């Protein structure tokens, strides 16, 4: 790849050199390797979470009696796990021969935690078998160990899919980079009240912006629109997971 | 027990003798054995199922694409299974020594099917592991085999709890008899629109009458009021099962 020409930045004013943590450099290398290896498309969608939000907030009591804080992430994890089982091409990697897909029969999902030293993505194993408060506890633990440098490399491995949630900071949508060898990543942004047509008038519904980046060698455009559509459907009524 | 004095019924008019199917006689003996062995109390409650009903009816599409009819029974089964795990004394039997309870670590639930030849109670095994449409299919199959005399004795055994639903015929409530050695049975009657106080006015909510009979040697009055209260809570928002 043609390199970027060096510039003497000090010709234009005062500069200062700060160094990169090894964690940032590892991260830098991994993203650029994904970038050049995966042809990326982002599919955007927004889900109606008015009812999900009401549930979240009502179970604040239960969650606190169990010591966890029920946020939107355990709900996101549960729903993507159900869906990764319904649409198995999202739960696979491209074989090194380029001629086969390795479909995984397990569902472990990573989630982005941004710490001082860099971004870490802890992995929760067998998300499909854990409950909303179990996933809530685990997420919280892994996030804390990630911030406190106590996260052993074991827990950063063998994920099938990544969720990256920035809803707690802001933004309308973003285009995340697929953490290869996984084949998709779900970006989640800030929810806001939007007017939604009820067939007769605009009702305010709470809308969650979803941004699915995927590896289009493996997942074609229609399979991906169907994944964010099913996800939007499941988050609008999470009871559909029960059937 | 003092016998009932024989009466010549033909002194008062014309009589006719029809006989009992062996199935009815078996049933007769089992109920009278339960009646004299179990001191019975019925706890009545009613659950708000307006939202449950809306869900049921929306998933009519899915249910039909899967060949099952989603009725209230799979929902009842799923919720009691969750609860039989939360409150394990309901999932046990009294040891023959009268001094111990055998707590079962499994959840199989029977449901009353009334056929021409008598009442049968098929058992669905490990209700706690099956989904709403799985339970829907299984219930339907067992009911059909029960009506067609093709139900092998294997499937009438080892239940932990019974549900008896008469909501499809009518009634406000009833007092079911515990099928000993189980320790409780849930009677379900007809749902109707009732006025329920919202703190300010009466709102129409769809109410399901629940009638829990139990063996009060094993389950005391407060444990039983708490079981129908948790059940009413779970049916008002079945998403609580997810956490």
UniProtKB/Swiss-Prot annotation, chains A, B:
Annotated segments matching region Catalytic: 1-243
Record: active site: 216
Superkingdom, natural source: Bacteria
Function of the molecule: The pyruvate dehydrogenase complex catalyzes the overall conversion of pyruvate to acetyl-CoA and CO(2). It contains multiple copies of three enzymatic components: pyruvate dehydrogenase (E1), dihydrolipoamide acetyltransferase (E2) and lipoamide dehydrogenase (E3).
Family to which this protein belongs: Belongs to the 2-oxoacid dehydrogenase family.
Subunit note: Forms a 24-polypeptide structural core with octahedral symmetry.
Record-given protein name: Dihydrolipoyllysine-residue acetyltransferase component of pyruvate dehydrogenase complex
Species for this entry: Azotobacter vinelandii
Organism placement in taxonomy: Bacteria, Pseudomonadati, Pseudomonadota, Gammaproteobacteria, Pseudomonadales
Residues of the full protein shown: 396 to 638 of 638
